Amino acid sequence: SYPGKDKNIPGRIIEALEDLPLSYLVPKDGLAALVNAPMRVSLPFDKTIFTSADDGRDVNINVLGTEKERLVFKRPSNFTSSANSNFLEGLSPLAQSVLSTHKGLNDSINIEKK
């Protein structure tokens, strides 16, 4: 003969748990994968070429239009800097010209999938 006996309250421990999820079981799903990823295993190829200035070969780099290919670049998931605060400065002069020259091919294409 105890209080609320007559009421509709659980009387046995298994019943007290119907609206109690075993929340002391904290899931660790994914934490090991956080150690293990991202992971790169790569193979260096450390060998110089075109050090011998002895080279009488020379090239006329007027690329652009001239098998098959049509390169498509990867739309990255994040910007790598936040916009809350031009990138050719530092290029050597030969380089900067070639880029002004072939400004037409810098009509690339960025897309995404896998």
Next chain:
Amino acid sequence: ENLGDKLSISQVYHLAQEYRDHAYSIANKIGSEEGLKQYYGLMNMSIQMFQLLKTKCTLSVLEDSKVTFEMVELLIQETYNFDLAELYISSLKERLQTHQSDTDLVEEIMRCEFLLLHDLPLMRDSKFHYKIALRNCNELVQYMVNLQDELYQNWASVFQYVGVMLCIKLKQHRRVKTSFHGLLSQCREKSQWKWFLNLCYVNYLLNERFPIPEDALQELRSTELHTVGPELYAWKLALEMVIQLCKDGNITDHLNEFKNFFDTNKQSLVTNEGKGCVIKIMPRIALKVELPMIFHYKELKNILLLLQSVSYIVNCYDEKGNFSRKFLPKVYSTTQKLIKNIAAGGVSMNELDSRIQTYKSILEFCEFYKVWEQTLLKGAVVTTESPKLGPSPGYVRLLQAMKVQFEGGGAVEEYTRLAQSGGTSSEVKMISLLNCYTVQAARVSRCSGDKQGELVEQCNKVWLQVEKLLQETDLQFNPIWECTVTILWLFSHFEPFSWNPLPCSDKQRAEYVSKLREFYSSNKFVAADNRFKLKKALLLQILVNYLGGRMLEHDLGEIYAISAKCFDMCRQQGGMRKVQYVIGIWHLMNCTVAMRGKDVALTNAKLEALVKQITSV
């Protein structure tokens, strides 16, 4: 006056190298849709330059190689032209194989296979291609072991590892476990190679929650710092830490070995930061390993704290959980400082892109384990916002099913659906199954016989899915898990814990009751040191002592001290009132029997106020 269009060959090639390496310096500076076309402009140029040298020049076999490689590296890391990059690598290979008997071309030819069988199929991420890469990678290995030279035995071991890494991607988990052992069994003992491959095995099992076989566990403990070097060793330490956190063990010894390590090797991870780990298997067989979270000193302490913080989640109420409510947000800021201050390079923008994406997942773990610490301490799901997938499969619809069970809604629908779909981890499958068996067993007791024929039916199913997913995972060695299995069997197969206890043999009672004694004898309010001790989980400790005090205690002063305690504990976390009540009836008997007069009076008032609240509006 200078030329710009009839250049030496070394100038053409050094211009491809400059356009690339300039992109590698503005990679962490892209903030706009514009700046992206600048970055990929500099890469477009570098790729088409390397193509010029290949078509408009005559190159030696070594120049075709170092050039074709440098170009393919960019096709692979910057475009989706995987079919194309595979053309260049197969052509370069087929050429090198014409000269291969009058010139030494093994390093180049192996490096080609590595691109066809490892680097490319991973970036592709296509089950069809993986299935082909493996066909080929096996054909390669099965062919090289028939060459007795010491080089070809070491390269087969390299492609035996490429063979495994693919099976993991193809989720052919038996092949994975079989090969990893055949590979490790052949590697020269106590070698940095075997110890790296082994670190890969252990970490593979943890990702699938598979139980870690004994030899591998000793191989991990026996890793020597001076044969494996501070990068691979900080990985060995990370794995042991994670092994404890998984069996809910104690991590004090581990956080201290990490401190002994850090006191003598911190500069190795800061000064050497960037240069990676190189595993010299042989003269001219050296593999580079980059593990960014584990190898760079700052990045490691941030991971390492989130683990220390996930262990103390269950302590929550008033001590070690004060460590978690203090240090989970610092993970979030120190993780946020690693994103704002990300620096190139000189790696792809997309390398830095994915290292950001891992940092963004670490952010989502924190916004989760705060919602969990809020559901322990308060007995309800804060649910909140929406636009998150949960840092794992359906941690959202687990959190959302729990919010249904909390609301008395049963959630038998949600927990079966969550444990039915193949995408969910094996652990979350189990948490969903136990909560099911708990709700189904609760009904067998508190339901009539009309609904019970169907509900005795369900309780049997759901119990065996639990017998299963427990026996094939590493949870079977987590004491908090084995004990919760005991608690629930006894509660459902014994009166007065179920109104309609489920049938069982005398032998099965002898089993489980003898179990509970080991747990009870070792966790009862008289604390020791062994494999049966439990983290101070409140709900768990309370049920262990109600259950255990009620079945194994015979003295009456003893039984009064215990029920007095259990009863007072229940206030420590929210959402406990209906358990506090069933405990107070129990204390109320023990008081009346022991004639503790006043106690029978107070406990009546305490139970009157609980009935008032349990039936509130």
Next chain:
Amino acid sequence: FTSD
């Protein structure tokens, strides 16, 4: 504890 807690470095920088």
